[PDB]
């Protein structure tokens, strides 16, 4: 068989013009061909007839659909392709992934992007290590917010941590007079720790409203998903410095690495196939036929795709097609209004380069330092330093979260 990669429209040109001849997939059971095909136009029917020719001729089951930049619906198109192929199509960027969500029941499509639940848990951990027990939930009408709210609430009440929610905000943003009522409740949000769920187009105007009211000042903290970030390359200069956001490993985990990992995963699934049942799946004869005999194969294929123990890293994917082991990047805005990495979410662990929360708030003229820097020195019974309980992220209420500041002796 073979693996086919498509470069639709605005696909990364250089990441193929130099990364086409960097493929190594040996020391496994299968020997598939890398088929690079580039269509510099967003024509649907062109890629549809290309995949039809693929099915009719090239007996290809693994397809790395490596294009980008818009319209999750196109993956929906892929899903229909999946609905007529049962093949594992993979999302690598844009309309294929980091926009895809809430897949269908009969969906044979797959993605390495995290689920709304997963990044919601990531930001909840973010505020957990920063002992932010108070938080206000604000979200627009954009579908995919009801389940996000349910997930975060279920995590809250199923948590021994003393989490406190101020108010859940449901926003009908595209309503003309709704904005007139909106300032009634948006102004009524006093908590500095607010979590947001909307889109980038929604994000711009909601941030404008917040700035006109004053929700972007000192103390206030903004938690937002990767959707509002859109394409982080085009940095929105209006958005405030100190805004902290989640995204995928964009600048580190490069596109050639993505496609090579996808091909390796598909080859691993094929190896499990040929090791457990030992037959190569047969392509459908024509693009206008229906068959169900692949049933005890199709999901079974997904079975050997749901358990991908390759590269040593057990990155086996979740039942919805996402990965149970996601890596996420947490970025804040720089002084020149750029996004830089601060937080890493890898193998269920959250780390941050600047552990101390830097006062990257709107740079107000020097004030009375209401948040003073204090040095201590351990001395019983006046000062006692002991280990934080890893369960609650703190100790007894008589304790204070004191960060012992090692000065690296040789590093």
């Amino acid at each position: 068989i073979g693996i086919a990669v498509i470069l639709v429209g605005t696909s990364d040109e250089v990441a193929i013009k130099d990364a086409h001849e960097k493929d190594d997939f040996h020391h496994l059971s299968v020997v598939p061909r890398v088929e690079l095909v580039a269509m510099n136009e967003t024509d649907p029917k062109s890629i549809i007839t290309r995949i039809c020719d693929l099915m009719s001729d090239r007996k290809i089951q693994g397809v790395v659909f490596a294009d980008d930049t818009d319209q999750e619906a196109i993956a929906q198109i892929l899903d229909f392709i999946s609905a007529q192929t049962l093949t594992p199509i993979l999302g690598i960027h844009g309309g294929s992934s980091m926009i895809m969500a809430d897949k269908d029941e009969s969906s044979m499509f797959f993605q390495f992007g995290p689920s709304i639940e997963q990044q919601a848990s990531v930001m909840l951990n973010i505020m957990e290590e920063y002992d932010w027990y108070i938080f206000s939930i604000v979200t627009t009408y954009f579908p995919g917010y009801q389940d996000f709210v349910n997930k975060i609430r279920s995590t809250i009440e199923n948590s021994f941590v003393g989490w406190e929610l101020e108010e859940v905000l449901l926003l009908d943003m595209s309503l003309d007079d709704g904005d007139s009522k909106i300032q009634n409740q948006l102004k009524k949000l006093q908590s500095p720790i607010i979590l947001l769920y909307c889109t980038k187009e929604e994000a711009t105007y909601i941030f404008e409203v917040a700035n006109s009211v004053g929700l972007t000042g000192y103390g206030y903290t903004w938690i937002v998903p990767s959707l509002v970030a859109g394409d982080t390359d085009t940095v929105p200069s209006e958005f405030p410095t100190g805004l902290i956001s989640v995204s995928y490993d964009e600048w580190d985990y490069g596109l050639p690495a993505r496609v090579r990992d996808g091909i390796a995963i598909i080859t691993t699934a094929a190896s499990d196939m040929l090791s457990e049942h030992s037959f190569i799946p047969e392509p459908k004869s024509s693009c206008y036929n229906t068959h169900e005999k692949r049933i005890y194969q199709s999901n079974m294929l997904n079975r050997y795709l749901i358990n991908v123990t390759f590269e040593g890293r057990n990155l086996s994917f979740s039942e919805d097609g996402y990965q149970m082991h996601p890596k996420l990047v947490i970025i804040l805005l720089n002084k020149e209004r750029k996004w830089e990495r601060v937080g890493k979410w890898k193998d269920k662990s959250l780390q941050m380069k600047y552990y101390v929360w830097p006062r990257m708030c709107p740079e107000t003229e020097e004030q009375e330092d209401d948040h003073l820097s204090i040095v201590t020195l351990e001395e019983a019974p006046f000062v006692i330093v002991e280990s934080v309980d890893p369960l609650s992220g703190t100790c007894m209420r008589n304790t204070v979260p004191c960060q012992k500041r090692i000065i690296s002796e040789n590093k």
Partner: antibody
Amino acid sequence: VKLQESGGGLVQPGGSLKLSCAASTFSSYTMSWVRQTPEKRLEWVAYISNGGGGTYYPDTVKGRFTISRDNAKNTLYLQMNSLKEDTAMYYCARPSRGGSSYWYFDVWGAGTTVTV
Amino acid sequence: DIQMTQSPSSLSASLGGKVTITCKASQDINKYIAWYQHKPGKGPRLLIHYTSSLQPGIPSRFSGSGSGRDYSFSISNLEPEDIATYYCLQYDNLYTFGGGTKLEIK
């Protein structure tokens, strides 16, 4: 990129001489070289990938060959043993488009002989 | 691994005649076909791709047709600078080869 063979000879009948083929990217490119019969048949000898794995032979020369490669020097290493009945002419071939699979090349060697 | 047998044994034709050699494999190949010619002591030259796709620099003197596991490759209007021997290549497995044939002019 061009291929030049070296290390041809069968001075000991049934012995082991390690033939090789230097290249001038070939880093992601596999290998498969050819013997010629007095009938001039382009018979295969050994099989390697770009990553060195998949060590196999055709049914003609199985059970007597030690195989390896070094992409740093762009060279192969195989000691021929069961070519003692031939005036063999072997040449190295670099399969095109590289990869772990095997495709239709036009980048072959130059040609050096092995005679008993 | 799979093995082939090419056949038969000859390319007997005059100046500008017509010959054909068959790729015959022990297993289904799905039109995996290549073709090579080389002088004794010179080196191979590529002829044919999946759909008998000739390569630039090699004229349309060579054609062919076939499917599944059996293919035929025909040579005509041959000029006595290609005194060579033609061979077929399949890669269902890693690689596979058959017997092949040599060209003589009468």
